[PDB]
Design a protein around this ligand. Structure first.
Ligand SMILES: NC(=O)c1ccc[n+]([C@@H]2O[C@H](COP(=O)([O-])OP(=O)(O)OC[C@H]3O[C@@H](n4cnc5c(N)ncnc54)[C@H](O)[C@@H]3O)[C@@H](O)[C@H]2O)c1
Ligand SMILES: NC(=O)c1ccc[n+]([C@@H]2O[C@H](COP(=O)([O-])OP(=O)(O)OC[C@H]3O[C@@H](n4cnc5c(N)ncnc54)[C@H](O)[C@@H]3O)[C@@H](O)[C@H]2O)c1
Lengths: 475, 489, 489, 488
């Protein structure tokens, strides 16, 4: 399976199903986080490159265009085709993802790529099921709504789940007849660029998808400010998302959906299946080195089970292993101190591993409290702050005390507690006796400052459609 | 019979509504709203600023709070309160119509039968949605139970314009309340009256205290404090495009609160030779001129096919001149004063522009009499795409009539602008009508009609005419947050 | 709170057609009697095929195109429903009384349950009236495809005596909401309330012919409906055997559309981790409510071995102690059984339990004979084989069974040809959701019983009927989906 | 383009149960014949009640809780469906040939229509599988209320001879994506495609017992299905008379649920302001498509007075210039009438037009002396009362009526007990939309005919049937709504 010495075939700007060099001629250079060594130079796009791509997108989206004349099932066939090719070339994409992220290949293969496929097929099924409405009004009137495509849509995605995150936009966008302008992170532009090949092979017309790699303030900012981009979807940081919205509003009031991060709680009750709670919550905090937006950053446990839970979690940290079949965590592309200075107790880790890359030991705090920064600030790293609570009412308030709400998980055997907390928590997703359970068909998103809009599920389709009303009076 | 005008009406409600009680300014200060038609001040209203907005939002926050009387209601009870509140709006209907006529110059009958009828039907429409706001059960794995909950957002803000002060406020109030969240309103400074009245009724109907708060004042002040507030979660704005940008930006800078916008448009009205020319002429007239031409749905570009063009203009001239202008309160008046001195200028300045860019003036072209702010109905012909009266939002009684030859031509000319609120089409051809309707980049396309809106039919803009939608089942999307619950057994 | 009307005179006793009161064509009458005070009440007009013929033509002319009903706006149709729930509220106590008279229900149960129900249901569907939406469907680029959700037409409603007005409202509300016209037909034992409601339908302002009532007998009038060439849909609630007949009748005649609510043998399942008090009080109300003369009745109560005994003892403490008596007294929870016949039907079966060996824990005999009153009975050591946990008991009898495992209780509970309702008591999340999924009921309650909403659909599985009443799902039953496909040149 | 397989060799002839081929309990067989080469094709096993019991039993078990088919995840059910649409595509030419041999349908027509439909239908619903959603309903603060859309159980399908594979797929597609198990029963006159589809259902990986097929006769196997106490829903497409019977039996037995799709006396209304040329060709393909043997068939063509005479002249030109012949020849647009009973039935009604005074503009007879081929036939000056304006012909006959007023045509169109389809030709926005409202039909076409999509529901008003097929609307017919209500 592993393809360790894989050649990179695609490094240029995809626009109109043709490969392109920068207008400047500049390149920048991506690196294998694991080796620290350069992989290849890929083309560095800037403003003029974006204009080129957006004019492509507009032509493809023009009325009379081939892409627009396609009937509805056929937009669906194309995606089905595109999924098939991702699946065909699954191991490559998996291998390229590992090459730019450091993600374990098996993980990329079974998680990132599994996701891209399912999502692509999920949303192939919506293409002929995008329905407006016939609205009753007056006897002498025929009023209905059309769910039109918006137009040119841009995607701007982060480095942790590059392809997946990109695919979450692409799948629905195209399903609804939009045309796109993608920008993967500077750190990880390989699998995106590969996919563009696959988008050509699958048979999408020219300029329905265009890709310009580069930097945020150059390429990204060119998009968000662009007067002919109609809609945008960003996933990345709270700090940058605001800029995107700020930029959309100054420009053409383009539509923005944002998926940013969060201070996601896990809430463990005395009556929980304690083992599972320790297990899941550990998969919550530490998965991908804590470099996942769904990351569990705040673990709440009830007094009766507090000391027990911690022991078990300290037990979990040390015991799992460090492209191999057995590798569970890859390299990183203080808060730990301020926890010590503010009085929290550390039961394991607290420093780096051995002199081989930016790896932190799994670190677990106990005696944590709300006022602490390890409970207030996005760690983006393998730190497990366990906090104590007594009242289900207390924990509901404490849990909701951040400006975020992307995720929450609640462990309990009690039906009434399960649904209570579920209604009370302010989070786009509430897991009950699981963590990281996501589906192409279940919507995902954030409350409050974790984002706007939703991705996946039917709800996704609203973000890539413009509702037009046609109201007809009869004589 | 026609309700009888209340010319002597005494403003009862002038202060800041917060927690179901009236309060004066944190500063003490007050501003003054006048009657466009009398030129005479009506009264002084409390002037609000940040410290007041903050007092209000904490009411809204406390009432949205978990456990609060407002949150524990049945769905249907929330819906019943909405019904009650329309009942009061209908009982005090003539009174509320009169306020809106004193404040804006609107003909009394128009406010009575249009503005208030809208508020009523819309409150009732959304009263209806209260216990029909439904999430989903979603199939996944055998071992998993997955479903969504359409939750209320939290505190919602409303900032509205002067042209439809109550209506634009209601369009936001109705679904916002229907969906179980709390509010903080700011009406336009030029028109704070009818919204303040709506305060008293929202109390009488039995909405718990703190569910609705109304802090009148200015845009850069109260408008800004609302837009930027850390504990406001959604905002609905209706107003000038320029001020939307300002609001969306601030939302974006502050807490990423969510934002619906309704901005202006440059709405095309397309008339084909095979149209019923009378209907077309009659509809485009009311489309241009309704509400003193001060409405976003206004027809700022009438496009007419050459075969029927000359007569179109001829019939459209009749309607312009025959149209009664004068006292809002007189039963025969269809046209009242422009809201204030500024718009009266803006409109005049631009009318001169139409003559200074060479358009053939067919009626009016001037103020009507020095008394006040009354502009003659004006019609321009031999109009072209590049004149200012053909690019800019006139927001006054002015009917530009352009010309075209082919449908494919008129679609491009229609779609040339950055806005897309409304379009209208007149033709007897089934194919033309549906072609145009598909092609026009407007949120509402009308066919053989104009200004046909329904509470059940959504309203909003393409491109730079705005973001979300208002009215319809669609409107509940802007007041709900989707929460996904996923359970593994 | 509200004061009984002990001797209320019946005003409405005649055939309602075109908002006019008529007497039978034959001239016959029939007479309804009071279970609590066995005195005949009044004589009510007995109709037959020719009376039906007359209503169905009213209903047709009323559904005819151009008619005032048909031309109403959506919202206006909902206003009419809304007003009808207002008048039902005003005369609520009257209605409660007539129902309480005709059926024997405690007056207060008729007031806070039956009529509460009619009102909420009427108000809920008034709210659907302008929200009954079809679809625009993406097909080809050259094509406009959309569905219209149209009214079926003349719909007939045939109802039982256990909840005379409620069952009639479940059908009238959504039917009129989607724009159909109706012919109604209450049970012969209970024609009073319906006939009343006709006066209200007239007052509230629905045009003539929209709703007609024709009381009478089943094999006479009911059969004339089910067989009727110009009736387009039917809803029937009642017994299975009559059900199948109406379906057959329909198939032969014009393939009119049919939805059925029939009985069920509805299990309660109780688990050891249940809230034990809560589980007895729910199981108790559930078996015994409306003298056990309810389709939702719990006929088979399952209880886990560990927690069995103490269940039985708390059940009998509820059973002995619950006050039986005169409907009109504030403190009576149980009234007479509907009549002499249904009062004896059950007592036969009370021996079934004693015959095949089942420990009776309280009651067991008819109490006093000059009234239709059975003492609340509870059986224990009940088993699957026994007729008491197998045939529709139609009354106040609590068969309590025994089980060990969750898998055991899932096959047993499912082993009937019925599945209208189920209930589950446990504090466990996985067990509850498992069972909710596993059981084959149209409604599964969890730690509650008889929790119904005008919002939540109700209807059976298998032989318990077909179709759903209440909720959004109802409208499906009162509409005919039409597809309009248009190709553009 | 695709090549006829003229003497194809039939592989599948037996009863399909638990993904195994079976012989009748009787051992008896019945013979299938080719309408164009009046020769027997092969013998098929002939089922009866004991076979049906065997099949229902299989399908109960496959539906059983904990069964593999019940445990497949949402998306996987839609994967298997896609797979099958894959196999149907691969073997498209074999199948399209069987259907022509079985039915007399022009190979190319069966290929690019019947088989096209099946695949798009399969694919469409493969798509709904993970999108079948119930609702979360707000009630009290106290309460969590939601619905589930559960499969009903064992579904039966009974289908006619005119579109054996198509009509079967309209039922199987939504039934299988909603999680059901099925017992199929194709027409005795056209069993072959349904029997081939079993190998694909097997090859594609559906578990044993999910789909079962019992070829045979109406009163035996249909009646054993329709009456079965352990079959939960029945989908019937066929004659009104058998519809009624199926429905009664459903009622009498276990109150099983019933969808029906019956015939119609569909109108085609042509106004003077139509694109006459467009109207003539659409009406023409409407009446004669599938040798007239389709339930969407345009059996009353109303034409406004001005364009009436002209309309008739063009209609005969198409009528005579339509190639009738060997199904397998590329040029042939019309084939043989399904068999002898229909062939005879059609010709009597033609004589009925003659006996009642309709002006015959072409045909009026059989063609090649002793085949099952009828010359395309056009009647003119037709009136509402004649037998050709009243009874489903189901043959290449085009009865043409005249009208004056719209309201008159509305009334005349709606005068039958049927409402399956209608169609309207006009350029006029108002006139089209007014008729669309007024015509009591499940499907109204405007400036087209026979335009169906796997996303647009189809079904009857009035006695043309109850319930719907195709579109989201179909999933309701293959599911049972369950309300779950929790009190905290
Ligand atoms: N084409 C367009 O987009 C468009 C649309 C409407 C009006 N206009 C122009 O605007 C003028 C009148 O203004 P208007 O009331 O219609 O719209 P406006 O945006 O000036 O006012 C609408 C509301 O916004 C509030 N507001 C003002 N400044 C604000 C700020 N900085 N932050 C938050 N809220 C603020 C005001 O108080 C008022 O409540 C007219 O001359 C008209 O021509 C243009
Ligand atoms: N709308 C109508 O009235 C209509 C439509 C088409 C054909 N027909 C008549 O029927 C004949 C052709 O029949 P068809 O195949 O179109 O439909 P059909 O109703 O005769 O039978 C079609 C399907 O139903 C089955 N079936 C037959 N009898 C049954 C029974 N007793 N119980 C259960 N299932 C049964 C058949 O075997 C087949 O599977 C024609 O000669 C014509 O006269 C009537």
């Amino acid at each position: 399976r592993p393809i360790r010495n894989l050649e990179v075939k695609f490094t240029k700007i995809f626009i109109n199903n043709e490969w392109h060099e920068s207008k400047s001629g500049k390149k920048f250079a991506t690196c294998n986080p694991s080796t620290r060594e350069q992989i290849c130079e890929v083309e560095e796009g800037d403003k003029p490159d974006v204009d080129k791509a957006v004019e492509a997108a507009q032509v493809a989206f023009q009325r009379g265009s081939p892409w627009r004349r396609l009937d509805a099932l056929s937009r669906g066939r194309l995606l089905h085709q595109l999924a098939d090719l991702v699946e065909r070339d699954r191991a490559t994409l998996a291998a390229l993802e590992t090459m730019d992220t450091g993600k374990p290949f098996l993980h990329a293969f079974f998680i990132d790529l599994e996701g891209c496929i399912r999502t692509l097929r999920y949303f192939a099924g919506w293409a002929d099921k995008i329905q407006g409405k016939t609205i009753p009004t007056d006897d002498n009137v025929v009023c209905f709504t059309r769910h039109e495509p918006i137009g040119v849509c841009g995607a701007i995605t982060p480095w942790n789940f590059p392809l997946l995150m990109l695919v979450w936009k692409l799948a629905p966008a195209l399903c609804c007849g939009n045309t796109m302008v993608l920008k993967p992170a500077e750190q990880t532009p390989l699998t995106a660029l590969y996919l563009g090949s696959l988008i050509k092979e699958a048979g999408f017309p020219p300029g329905v998808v265009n890709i310009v790699p580069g930097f945020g303030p150059t390429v990204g900012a060119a998009i968000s400010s662009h007067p002919q981009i109609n809609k945008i979807a960003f996933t990345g940081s709270t700090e940058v998302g605001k800029l995107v919205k700020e930029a959309a509003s100054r420009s053409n009031l383009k539509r923005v959906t944002l998926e940013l991060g969060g201070k996601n709680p896990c809430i463990v009750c005395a009556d929980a299946d304690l083992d599972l709670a320790v297990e899941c919550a550990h998969q919550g905090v530490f998965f991908n080195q804590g470099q996942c937006c769904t990351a569990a950053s705040r673990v709440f446990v009830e007094e009766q089970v507090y000391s027990e839970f911690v022991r078990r979690s300290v037990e979990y940290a040390k015991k799992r292993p460090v492209f191999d079949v057995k590798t569970e965590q890859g390299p990183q592309i203080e808060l730990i101190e301020s926890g010590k200075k503010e009085g929290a107790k550390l039961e394991c880790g607290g420093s780096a591993m051995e002199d081989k890359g930016l790896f932190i030991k799994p670190t677990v705090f106990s005696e944590v409290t709300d006022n602490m920064r390890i409970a207030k600030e996005e760690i983006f790293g393998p730190v497990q702050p366990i906090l104590k609570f007594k009242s289900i009412e207390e924990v509901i308030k404490r849990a909701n005390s951040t400006d975020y709400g992307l995720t929450a998980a609640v462990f309990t055997k009690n039906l009434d507690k399960a649904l209570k907390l579920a209604s009370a928590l302010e989070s786009g997703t509430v897991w009950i006796n699981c963590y990281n359970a996501l589906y192409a068909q279940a919507p995902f998103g954030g409350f409050k400052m974790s984002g706007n809009g939703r991705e996946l599920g039917e709800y996704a389709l609203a973000e890539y459609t413009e509702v037009k009303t046609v109201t007809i009076k009869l004589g």
